[PDB]
Design a protein around this ligand. Structure first.
Ligand SMILES: [Mg+2]
Ligand SMILES: [Mg+2]
Ligand SMILES: [Mg+2]
Ligand SMILES: [Mg+2]
Ligand SMILES: [Mg+2]
Ligand SMILES: [Mg+2]
Ligand SMILES: [Mg+2]
Ligand SMILES: [Mg+2]
Ligand SMILES: [Mg+2]
Ligand SMILES: [Mg+2]
Ligand SMILES: [Mg+2]
Ligand SMILES: [Mg+2]
Ligand SMILES: [Mg+2]
Ligand SMILES: [Mg+2]
Ligand SMILES: [Mg+2]
Ligand SMILES: [Mg+2]
Ligand SMILES: [Mg+2]
Ligand SMILES: [Mg+2]
Ligand SMILES: [Mg+2]
Ligand SMILES: [Mg+2]
Ligand SMILES: [Mg+2]
Ligand SMILES: [Mg+2]
Ligand SMILES: [Mg+2]
Ligand SMILES: [Mg+2]
Ligand SMILES: [Mg+2]
Ligand SMILES: [Mg+2]
Ligand SMILES: [Mg+2]
Ligand SMILES: [Mg+2]
Ligand SMILES: [Mg+2]
Ligand SMILES: [Mg+2]
Ligand SMILES: [Mg+2]
Ligand SMILES: [Mg+2]
Ligand SMILES: [Mg+2]
Ligand SMILES: [Mg+2]
Ligand SMILES: [Mg+2]
Ligand SMILES: [Mg+2]
Ligand SMILES: [Mg+2]
Ligand SMILES: [Mg+2]
Ligand SMILES: [Mg+2]
Ligand SMILES: [Mg+2]
Ligand SMILES: [Mg+2]
Ligand SMILES: [Mg+2]
Ligand SMILES: [Mg+2]
Ligand SMILES: [Mg+2]
Ligand SMILES: [Mg+2]
Ligand SMILES: [Mg+2]
Ligand SMILES: [Mg+2]
Ligand SMILES: [Mg+2]
Ligand SMILES: [Mg+2]
Ligand SMILES: [Mg+2]
Ligand SMILES: [Mg+2]
Ligand SMILES: [Mg+2]
Ligand SMILES: [Mg+2]
Ligand SMILES: [Mg+2]
Ligand SMILES: [Mg+2]
Ligand SMILES: [Mg+2]
Ligand SMILES: [Mg+2]
Ligand SMILES: [Mg+2]
Ligand SMILES: [Mg+2]
Ligand SMILES: [Mg+2]
Ligand SMILES: [Mg+2]
Ligand SMILES: [Mg+2]
Ligand SMILES: [Mg+2]
Ligand SMILES: [Mg+2]
Ligand SMILES: [Mg+2]
Ligand SMILES: [Mg+2]
Ligand SMILES: [Mg+2]
Ligand SMILES: [Mg+2]
Ligand SMILES: [Mg+2]
Ligand SMILES: [Mg+2]
Ligand SMILES: [Mg+2]
Ligand SMILES: [Mg+2]
Ligand SMILES: [Mg+2]
Ligand SMILES: [Mg+2]
Ligand SMILES: [Mg+2]
Ligand SMILES: [Mg+2]
Ligand SMILES: [Mg+2]
Ligand SMILES: [Mg+2]
Ligand SMILES: [Mg+2]
Ligand SMILES: [Mg+2]
Ligand SMILES: [Mg+2]
Ligand SMILES: [Mg+2]
Ligand SMILES: [Mg+2]
Ligand SMILES: [Mg+2]
Ligand SMILES: [Mg+2]
Ligand SMILES: [Mg+2]
Ligand SMILES: [Mg+2]
Ligand SMILES: [Mg+2]
Ligand SMILES: [Mg+2]
Ligand SMILES: [Mg+2]
Ligand SMILES: [Mg+2]
Ligand SMILES: [Mg+2]
Ligand SMILES: [Mg+2]
Ligand SMILES: [Mg+2]
Ligand SMILES: [Mg+2]
Ligand SMILES: [Mg+2]
Ligand SMILES: [Mg+2]
Ligand SMILES: [Mg+2]
Ligand SMILES: [Mg+2]
Ligand SMILES: [Mg+2]
Ligand SMILES: [Mg+2]
Ligand SMILES: [Mg+2]
Lengths: 134, 101, 77, 96
RNA sequence: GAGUUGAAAAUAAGCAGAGAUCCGGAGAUUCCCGAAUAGGUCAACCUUUCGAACUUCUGCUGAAUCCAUGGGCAGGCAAGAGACAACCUGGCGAACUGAAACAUCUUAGUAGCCAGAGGAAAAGAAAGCAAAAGCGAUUCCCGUAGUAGCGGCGAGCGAAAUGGGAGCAGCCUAAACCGUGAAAACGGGGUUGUGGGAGAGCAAUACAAGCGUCGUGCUGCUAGGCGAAUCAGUGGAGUGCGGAACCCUAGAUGGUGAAAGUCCAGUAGCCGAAAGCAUCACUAGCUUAUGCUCUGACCCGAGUAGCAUGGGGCACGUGGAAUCCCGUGUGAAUCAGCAAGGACCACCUUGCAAGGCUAAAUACUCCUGGGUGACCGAUAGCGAAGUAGUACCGUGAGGGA
RNA sequence: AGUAACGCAAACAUUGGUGAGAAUCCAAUGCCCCGAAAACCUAAGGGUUCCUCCGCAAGGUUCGUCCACGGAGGGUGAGUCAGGGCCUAAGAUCAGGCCGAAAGGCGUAGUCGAUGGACAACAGGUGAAUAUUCCUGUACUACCCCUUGUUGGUCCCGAGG
RNA sequence: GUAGAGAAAAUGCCUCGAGCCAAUGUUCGAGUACCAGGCGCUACGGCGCUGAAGUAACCGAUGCCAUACUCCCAGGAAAAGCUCGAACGACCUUCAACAAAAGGGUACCUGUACCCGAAACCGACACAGGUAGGUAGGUAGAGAAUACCUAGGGGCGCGA
């Protein structure tokens, strides 16, 4: 499978080298590049080695699956394929615009993210609880 | 929050109590290793939890010994001693529940 | 080794030279002797290998000066 | 005279690694009343006898060791004829 | 600051905003072999009275033998031992080759081996150069110079002084003498050269200079954080194209379906260290210290220098052969001296051997962190872009895709 | 060059069977060869080649349903057998010791070193793959345990063997 | 038993002993063991069930007594276990140690598969070769030669 050189890069302690990237899981984004350009969505899984993200209705691929279990029954499934994090921008639903993202400090002693075309705060204090309970 | 709690609990015990506790733990670890092979359903997380518990205990023990003023050689000697004097006793956890039953 | 303890003499590295100028490796050796020497301050002899120069020096400065410069205890000898 | 030094220094709780369950062993239980236990290579017979004698609380007749071509010690533990094997087979989870 | 349990999916369970996984500092554990070190062995095992063997260290004990030596016993986180690419120092030390043969000579004090120590080592504070004018420990580069010379006067080897730079730094001790002993030692005094010191008297005294526990200091390193600016169209995908805009203390770099200052990570700029490390300042303290006059009687590094022989090395091959350093044998002089100035003698100049220690400038790459490349792009570049010192071959050293 | 060869001149044959496919795989019946081996076992060596199930790319001098091949899963049980916990030979290392540019060389006690000395187990059964090892019978060494009998035993040393 | 510095030993003198030696043999171990057949099943592979007789003679080892003999010259390992024992030295000492016949108990590591006159080791090969030891049936034969056979194993990995 994995072309032997396309495997995961490594530190001396054997742990893979993670790209840092600008997005989280619960987020909503708009797709800037690729055939999926323009479509809006929400992010499910994110792989921090390749720097790639997966979005529920987007980048659909038609996969043939062979179920041989005493009979031959096949399945044609449509899955979602990872797309590169540089192809998406954070999307504001309110003023309905996709922007870049800066960091800001809130008086709570907190550090958060905001869209720089609006000034709209992205991260909610309970966001992680909201996603865990899902 | 289990970690901080457990450590505060550890540093407040005595030496003998630590020893005994350690033994009991290693035993439970044994019984666990038995269940694995029996293919009786159990928790994969448990090996980790227990092993690391034992670790933390030993660490504390040694860290005290260092305050007392003891070296590496003295350490290892008294350790051989303690491992010689070890007798197996049946684990209080699950073997006592087949003694009763 | 061929070495005097007391003066630290070494065998010297020297070419034997013929009438023909043809050189050859050779060793000149220290003149070493197995001697007993009287030690007055020990009331007793000491068996030693000595260079002869050392024997001389022992006549001149006395044994103890020599052994103290060379750092060798007559007791352990 | 002195303290009885165990043949090596091991820690007894790691010596009995596991029961070996295959078609083979089970009938050694049935016929011989003999358990089958993979143990630490560095472990001896006296160590194994004390270990099982105290742990499951059964008196053990005789122990036979073995060393696999893979370097893993394997022990036949034949208990006494008072203690039935299948007892410990149910107690442990080895079902004949 | 959000997901995580290596490569590496899948499965199973956990751990996680009272902060996980992760990154850095300091600790902890570290089976068996290996210096291997309780004793043994056929490395990775055995036997054990459970022991760091042996050598140094501290104490107790005390053979032949009075003092001693040896031995015995005990203490001790206990100094060493082994490993290490190249460079370096010492020790041994070739041969092919060149000379159109070869022996003196060359190769070359090279390779190799052995031992040793360091981040550099070695050398080093004038018994030195020079020449009648002067310099002022050592090392390194340029030059003098392929000069003077050496040489079966063949092949070849080959300086130095003046001159220019790099870099700078000077210190401890022996003896005379005064204390303490029966000594051997210890304590003060004393260290220099167009002479010092000891000796005997009279003056000056406070600053100056060198070293350095402790500690907030300064800076840097070892994790990090903030960080400007774009859209639609174009045939799989646009960073390209045509058309509009904008940032720039940022147009380094890497990635992104296709080439991007404006998409991501970043860059300029700017913040940031509980802990450890490093250079620096400060840091109680510790060190030292001057001045003149008289006195050739006291000292100024002895089996040493020299001499006779045998050699070695100096550019220098015994030559008229100094200087330097060694085998054998002899063997001085103390400053009214001794050595050097290319046999030797006279005169003058210069210097103070036979006790030690010292930073930098210079050499190197098993490597670490940055950077560049008229360097390679899978027959290349490392032997090695995948099990690479692997497979395989060899009893073995070794070879090796 | 689709040529030489296919590794002895012990010899195969037929009927069934399995299978997509059989001169070659299994079984039966003949026939033939070895039998101081071409039998059975053990030392050394090899290293999992052993057994079962699956497979038929490569290997196998043809074939292949088969295999010492590939894939999975198993398998080696000791007081008495063999070594070590006993003893020494040749030889090796060698505390101290003697010598040696260095590395080292010689060498005494010591300690290693079996191919030898010492020392206790056999029959039957089970058996996909182990058996003087597991089972059932009778045995035998070495310790420990108690009773009884004595008071000194232990090593170092002297000897016989 | 005695003697000499003399415990044991060696050595000298005195004494008591006619038997001794060891393969093998008889008996227990040992029979409701094993086994020819017999009965029944057949997954037609193997399995369950009951079992008669189990003695004698003659050949006869290269094996055992046996380091038993006789002869020869070339003159044929050491040390420990083992048996015996005073002085010297060290250490330990009373329910401590040693001495005994029974009785009960107790039981260290490592090898153990397979091949081994070989297709698995050694020969680069599934190679007409090399490889220590053990066991040694029948008929003929002086014989472990040869021929033909048993047990057991094979028909040589190209055929027609
Ligand atoms: Mg693939
Ligand atoms: Mg793109
Ligand atoms: Mg079995
Ligand atoms: Mg075994
Ligand atoms: Mg570690
Ligand atoms: Mg272990
Ligand atoms: Mg050792
Ligand atoms: Mg050793
Ligand atoms: Mg004393
Ligand atoms: Mg005395
Ligand atoms: Mg002494
Ligand atoms: Mg000691
Ligand atoms: Mg060293
Ligand atoms: Mg070395
Ligand atoms: Mg070093
Ligand atoms: Mg030559
Ligand atoms: Mg020549
Ligand atoms: Mg020539
Ligand atoms: Mg020539
Ligand atoms: Mg430097
Ligand atoms: Mg130096
Ligand atoms: Mg100076
Ligand atoms: Mg000077
Ligand atoms: Mg100059
Ligand atoms: Mg300058
Ligand atoms: Mg200067
Ligand atoms: Mg003095
Ligand atoms: Mg002074
Ligand atoms: Mg002068
Ligand atoms: Mg003067
Ligand atoms: Mg004075
Ligand atoms: Mg940023
Ligand atoms: Mg940006
Ligand atoms: Mg565009
Ligand atoms: Mg454009
Ligand atoms: Mg992109
Ligand atoms: Mg770019
Ligand atoms: Mg920066
Ligand atoms: Mg004077
Ligand atoms: Mg001379
Ligand atoms: Mg010369
Ligand atoms: Mg000369
Ligand atoms: Mg000179
Ligand atoms: Mg000169
Ligand atoms: Mg010399
Ligand atoms: Mg001389
Ligand atoms: Mg003089
Ligand atoms: Mg001279
Ligand atoms: Mg001079
Ligand atoms: Mg002088
Ligand atoms: Mg001189
Ligand atoms: Mg000097
Ligand atoms: Mg020096
Ligand atoms: Mg290629
Ligand atoms: Mg290559
Ligand atoms: Mg190519
Ligand atoms: Mg032809
Ligand atoms: Mg033809
Ligand atoms: Mg043909
Ligand atoms: Mg042929
Ligand atoms: Mg054939
Ligand atoms: Mg025949
Ligand atoms: Mg065969
Ligand atoms: Mg066989
Ligand atoms: Mg074998
Ligand atoms: Mg295999
Ligand atoms: Mg097979
Ligand atoms: Mg095939
Ligand atoms: Mg074929
Ligand atoms: Mg088939
Ligand atoms: Mg196979
Ligand atoms: Mg010998
Ligand atoms: Mg030697
Ligand atoms: Mg020695
Ligand atoms: Mg010896
Ligand atoms: Mg041995
Ligand atoms: Mg043997
Ligand atoms: Mg034995
Ligand atoms: Mg035996
Ligand atoms: Mg078998
Ligand atoms: Mg049997
Ligand atoms: Mg029987
Ligand atoms: Mg017995
Ligand atoms: Mg004896
Ligand atoms: Mg007697
Ligand atoms: Mg008597
Ligand atoms: Mg007698
Ligand atoms: Mg007869
Ligand atoms: Mg014969
Ligand atoms: Mg005889
Ligand atoms: Mg006595
Ligand atoms: Mg007795
Ligand atoms: Mg076996
Ligand atoms: Mg076998
Ligand atoms: Mg053969
Ligand atoms: Mg064949
Ligand atoms: Mg063959
Ligand atoms: Mg016959
Ligand atoms: Mg005949
Ligand atoms: Mg006959
Ligand atoms: Mg025959
Ligand atoms: Mg037959």
């Amino acid at each position: 499978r994995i072309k032997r050189w396309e495997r995961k890069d490594c530190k001396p302690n054997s742990l893979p080298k993670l790209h840092k990237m600008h997005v989280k899981v619960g987020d909503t984004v708009k797709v800037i590049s690729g055939g999926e350009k323009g479509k809006i969505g929400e992010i499910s899984k994110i792989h921090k080695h390749n720097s790639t993200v997966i979005i529920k209705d987007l980048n659909l691929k038609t996969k043939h699956v062979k179920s041989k279990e005493e009979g031959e029954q096949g399945q044609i499934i449509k899955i979602e394929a990872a797309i590169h994090s540089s192809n998406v921008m954070l999307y504001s639903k309110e003023q309905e615009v996709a922007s870049r993202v800066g960091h800001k400090i809130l008086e709570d002693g907190r550090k958060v993210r905001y869209l720089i075309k609006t000034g709209e705060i992205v991260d909610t204090p309970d966001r992680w609880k909201e996603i865990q309970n899902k | 929050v289990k970690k901080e709690d457990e450590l505060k609990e550890l540093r407040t015990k005595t030496n003998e109590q630590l020893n005994e506790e350690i033994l009991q733990l290693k035993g439970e670890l044994f019984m666990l290793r038995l269940q694995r092979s029996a293919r009786e359903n159990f928790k994969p997380s448990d090996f980790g939890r227990m092993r690391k518990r034992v670790a933390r205990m030993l660490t504390v023990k040694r860290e005290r010994e260092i305050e007392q003023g003891v070296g590496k050689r003295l350490s290892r000697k008294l350790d051989k001693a303690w491992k010689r004097s070890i007798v197996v006793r049946p684990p209080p956890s699950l073997k006592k529940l087949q003694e009763k039953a | 080794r061929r070495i005097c303890p007391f003066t630290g003499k070494k065998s010297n590295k020297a070419n034997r030279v013929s009438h023909s100028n043809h050189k050859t490796k050779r060793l000149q050796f220290v003149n070493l002797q197995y001697k007993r020497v009287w030690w007055e301050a020990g009331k007793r002899f000491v068996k030693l290998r000595l260079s002869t120069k050392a024997l001389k020096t022992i006549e001149k400065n006395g044994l103890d000066a020599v052994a103290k410069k060379a750092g060798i205890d007559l007791r352990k000898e | 005279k002195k303290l009885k030094y165990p043949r090596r220094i091991l820690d007894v709780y790691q010596i009995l690694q596991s029961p070996i369950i295959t078609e083979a062993a089970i009938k050694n239980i049935a016929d011989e009343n003999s358990l089958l236990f993979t143990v630490d290579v560095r472990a001896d017979k006296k160590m194994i006898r004390e270990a099982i004698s105290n742990f499951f609380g059964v008196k053990v007749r005789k122990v036979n060791t073995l060393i696999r071509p893979d370097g893993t010690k394997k022990a036949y533990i034949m208990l006494n004829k008072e203690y039935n094997a299948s007892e410990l087979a149910k107690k442990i989870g080895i079902f004949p």
